[PDB]
Design a protein around this ligand. Structure first.
Ligand SMILES: [Mg+2]
Lengths: 469, 419, 51
DNA sequence: CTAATAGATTAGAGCCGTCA
RNA sequence: UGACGGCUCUAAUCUAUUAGU
């Protein structure tokens, strides 16, 4: 018989120093940390897109319900939750004629038409930013479905612009990076889903029972992208820094030339939460290899340590490098040649490709969430997806898979590593969910890497997450 | 008098009533509501009248399509009107309208002439209006504290929604390996076997290694394919016991320990493949591995001990299938996966991977934990050899024994599955 | 320290770089939204910043 | 450098479900 | 591209050995 261990929920913090395990409940009960006054939005799109956005804004000023209030908390209105004004009166419109959109989406080349459409939108956005008086917090880009259908890299149509990714979203977000304009992209079938139907009279996407969930997600994203703090972690210890490393394939040239990006998280020391990308993309020329050369590893670790020191005033007492790969001896020797003497560097690998499933012998409900199986002093399985008794349901549909956490390098305690990994699953500001299945250090770094891989002209990019997510 | 009495419909206005009551408790007021109490019963009546008559200072009413013409609400309103006449307070009852389907002209006669607070267009301004009215009418209150609402929410609405200390046992998809042959043999067939023989088609699992042959088989086995093997000096065979290389306590210039483990894993995989060929089970070449599944009509009415392995879905028959991989970490195991494959008439697979993906996505939608585990253990038990094991035949007199029951795990924390 | 170099162009350049580096770092790498950046400057800096 | 046989580890795309 | 989860298909690279050399 093998023995399992349980790990308790980490809890998150809200206004008035009140702790809760859910973000929806804590937002409906207490409210967010900071005090915004109101969101002034800029809307660039067609006329019908503008009307759709206005209707949606008018829709979320009132309570919106789900089918079940236990499985899914309801939405009591934007001003009831966030204590700020986001209404369809502080809107500036930048019209985009439909004839231009039709004209540019026909060139029979994905790269060229994608470049033309991104140029069309960002030209108006940039011109409005540079030479106008109205102040805009977030720019809402409404996109028709015909643009979304044909602009994927593997989309079939029934040189100068070839040095870009063939994806509209990533190229759009990368080409606006040097201007630092927070923007949110909406499809036209997302805000008005009742009108778009298939050839049977029914909506293609049915949000009838999950309208409140969509309102929660959209409102939280809009609030965060406008400079609002929705919540923060409540049990982050002092002197510990979390660093996530993610690799991507640059490609789009002769050299695959792998690239690496980082994300950093630590405590502000003012009881805040510092959580920002640490990225100047570091390159490896050899194909298929996901390890840093000594120079790049030294540069990355030096930059991260200097950032922590400048923010806090002292070097960290503990550095956890979470990664999806293993480390070699050259990598870690380069890492250790710049680390200060009185600092502990632990390198942890979080893997998902490891088959193991636990079945309850009687019921039709899966294993409890915070269960873990410790193979050895340096390895353990952890269930981040599973049944949550608070909401009377699980975070998946079939039998969930656990994460295989291995202390690859250094000397640490596996139980504390599991506790920190479970705590890190409660910071997905790009969503409004009970909890994530992966630590956010390895997810936002991936998002940053996939954003600053769609262009080659980016230099000294911004680090705030609101310019990528 | 410190209480603020909230009247509502018990099963319909729960969301708004909870939200407003907890917000008011957070602001520092004292609130009476019937959703803030557990262990109810004879509490109804003879206690409601007492708190309305002797403790209530303001009577907040929630007006909606549900609370209009409800007996308890009307009786409480009558008592509140009598209390309002009893005291010198014309502003004792405050309606709060929330239902867009309740027109202002369809209000019950008791409150048609009262000035209400509007909540339909937004709840924040309604809360602000309530707070301003309370400040203007000097309703009693303490210092603001959101901890009271936090505690009440924890103790009332999170009551039976926690984890429970309960010992439970789980089944997994691992099968422990029970037996290993006593030696690993390297036969020195120095330039005696053909250079391009493709040793993967032999009768027993063998792997080329240097000018040798790594296998569990016997010295002069597989004599059919290699005719010139009888004249072979058995003293030149390199023999290494399996336990020493399994425990990691063997290493030499001939072969490292990791290489030995890798070759053992290869032998185990090939033996499993050959035995599954012996078992006469249909194959399915996936992207990188091979799965195994049963035809229609092979089992007695497609069941193995009251557990279906082949079934129907519209025009396509579904088939439960497994794939197995042998590993030496954490401990020597055979790991099993679960898949569903679809056929037009129970005998020929549909040659459309997109259709297979769509069917497998729409078929596992209704399959819960018990379905998955019952089908998995049924299919595994179907392969069992005699009573409790299953042998992979590594040679003429060599077998590897594997269990037919998966490894159990134990836990001390669970939930109460409250339907 | 900067306002003692006896060369007006050099010290003006140094002061402007010192201020704008901080302002740009605040702008780019942080989630805080600030509309108007108010620069409070001592009197001696203003007096000694003429050709 | 190079063509096969494994095991073991990596990234990339793309589709489907969320009620009950 | 409002999320998240689960699947399937397609590349690499490393290591050992064999034939190339
Ligand atoms: Mg977003």
């Amino acid at each position: 018989m093998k023995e399992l261990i349980y790990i308790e929920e980490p809890k998150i913090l809200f206004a008035h120093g009140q702790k809760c395990t859910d973000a929806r409940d804590g937002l409906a009960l207490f409210g967010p940390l900071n005090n915004l006054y109101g969101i002034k939005s800029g809307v660039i799109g067609t006329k019908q897109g503008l009307k759709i956005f206005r209707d949606y804004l008018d829709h979320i000023q009132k309570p919106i319900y789900n089918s079940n209030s236990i499985t899914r908390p309801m939405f009591p209105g934007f001003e009831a939750v966030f204590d700020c004004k986001w209404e369809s009166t502080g809107i500036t419109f930048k019209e985009v004629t439909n004839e231009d959109i039709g004209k540019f989406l026909y060139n029979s080349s994905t790269h060229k038409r994608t470049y033309d459409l991104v140029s069309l939108f960002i030209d108006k956005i940039i011109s409005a930013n540079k030479n106008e008086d109205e102040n805009v917090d977030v720019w809402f880009v409404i996109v028709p479905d015909e643009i979304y259908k044909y602009c994927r890299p593997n989309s079939v149509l029934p040189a100068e612009t070839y040095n870009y990714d063939a994806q509209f979203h990533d190229q759009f977000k990368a080409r606006l990076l040097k201007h630092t304009i927070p923007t949110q992209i909406f499809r036209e079938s997302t805000l008005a889903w009742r009108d778009f139907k298939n050839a049977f009279g029914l909506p293609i996407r049915d949000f009838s029972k999950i309208e409140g969930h969509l309102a929660w997600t959209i409102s939280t994203a809009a609030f965060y992208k406008a400079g609002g703090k929705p919540w923060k972690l409540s049990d982050v210890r002092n002197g510990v820094c979390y660093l996530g490393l993610v690799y991507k394939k640059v490609e789009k040239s002769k050299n695959p030339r792998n690239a690496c990006c980082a994300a950093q998280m630590f405590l502000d020391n003012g009881d805040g939460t510092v959580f920002k990308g640490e990225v100047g993309p570091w390159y490896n020329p050899k194909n298929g290899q996901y390890h840093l050369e000594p120079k790049e590893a030294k540069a990355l670790l030096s930059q991260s340590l200097q950032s922590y020191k400048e923010q806090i005033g002292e070097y960290p007492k503990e550095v956890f490098i979470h990664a999806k790969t293993r480390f070699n001896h050259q990598e870690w020797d380069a890492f250790l040649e710049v680390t200060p003497k009185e600092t502990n560097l632990v390198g942890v690998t979080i893997s998902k490709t490891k088959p193991l499933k636990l079945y309850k012998t009687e019921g039709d409900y899966t294993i409890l969430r915070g269960n873990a199986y410790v193979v050895n002093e340096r390895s353990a399985f952890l269930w981040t997806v599973g049944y949550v008794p608070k909401i009377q349901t699980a975070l998946s549909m079939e039998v969930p898979n656990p994460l295989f956490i291995e202390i690859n390098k250094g000397e640490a305690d596996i139980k504390q590593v599991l506790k920190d990994i479970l705590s890190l699953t409660k910071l997905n500001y790009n969503a409004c969910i009970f909890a994530d299945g992966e630590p956010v250090t390895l997810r936002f770094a991936d998002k940053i890497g996939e954003i600053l891989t769609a262009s080659t002209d980016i230099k000294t990019p911004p680090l705030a997450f609101k310019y990528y997510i | 008098r410190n209480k603020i009495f909230i009247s509502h419909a018990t099963p319909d206005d729960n969301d708004f009533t909870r939200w407003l009551a907890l917000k008011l408790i957070g602001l520092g007021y004292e609130v009476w509501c019937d959703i803030l109490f557990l262990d109810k019963g004879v509490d109804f009546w003879s206690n409601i009248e007492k708190v309305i008559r002797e403790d209530t200072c303001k009577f907040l009413l929630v007006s909606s399509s549900y609370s209009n013409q409800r007996e308890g609400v009307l009786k409480e309103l009558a008592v509140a009107a009598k209390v309002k006449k009893q005291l010198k307070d014309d502003k004792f009852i405050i309606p709060l309208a929330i239902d867009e389907q309740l027109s202002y002209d369809d209000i019950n006669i008791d409150i048609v002439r009262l000035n209400a607070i509007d909540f339909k267009m937004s709840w924040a301004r309604g809360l602000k209006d309530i707070l301003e009215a309370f400040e203007k009418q000097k309703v009693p209150k303490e210092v603001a504290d959101a901890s009271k609402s936090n505690l009440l929410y924890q103790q009332i609405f999170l009551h039976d929604k926690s984890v429970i200390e309960k010992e439970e046992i789980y089944d997994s998809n691992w099968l422990s390996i029970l037996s290993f042959p006593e030696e690993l043999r390297f036969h020195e067939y120095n330039w005696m076997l053909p250079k391009r023989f493709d040793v993967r088609e032999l009768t027993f699992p063998a792997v080329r290694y240097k000018n040798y042959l790594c296998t569990f088989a016997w010295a002069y086995d597989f004599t059919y394919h290699l005719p010139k093997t009888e004249t072979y000096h058995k003293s030149k065979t390199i023999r290494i016991p399996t336990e020493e290389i399994l425990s990691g306590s063997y290493d030499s210039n001939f072969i490292r320990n990791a290489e030995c483990k890798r070759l053992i894993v290869q032998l185990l995989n090939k033996a499993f493949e050959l035995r599954m060929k012996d078992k006469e089970v249909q194959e399915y070449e996936m992207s990188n591995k091979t799965a195994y599944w049963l035809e229609k009509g092979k089992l007695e009415k497609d069941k193995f001990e009251k557990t279906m392995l082949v079934g129907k879905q519209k025009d396509k028959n579904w088939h439960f299938a497994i794939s197995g991989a042998s590993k030496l970490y954490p401990f020597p195991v055979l790991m099993i996966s679960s898949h569903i494959f679809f056929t037009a008439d129970g005998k020929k697979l549909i040659d459309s991977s997109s259709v297979q993906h769509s069917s497998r996505r729409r078929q596992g939608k209704n399959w819960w934990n018990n379905t998955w585990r019952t089908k998995l253990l049924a299919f595994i038990k179907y392969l069992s050899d005699d009573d409790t094991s299953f042998y992979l035949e590594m040679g003429s007199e060599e077998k590897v024994f594997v269990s037919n029951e998966p490894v159990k795990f134990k836990g001390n924390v669970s939930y109460n599955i409250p339907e």
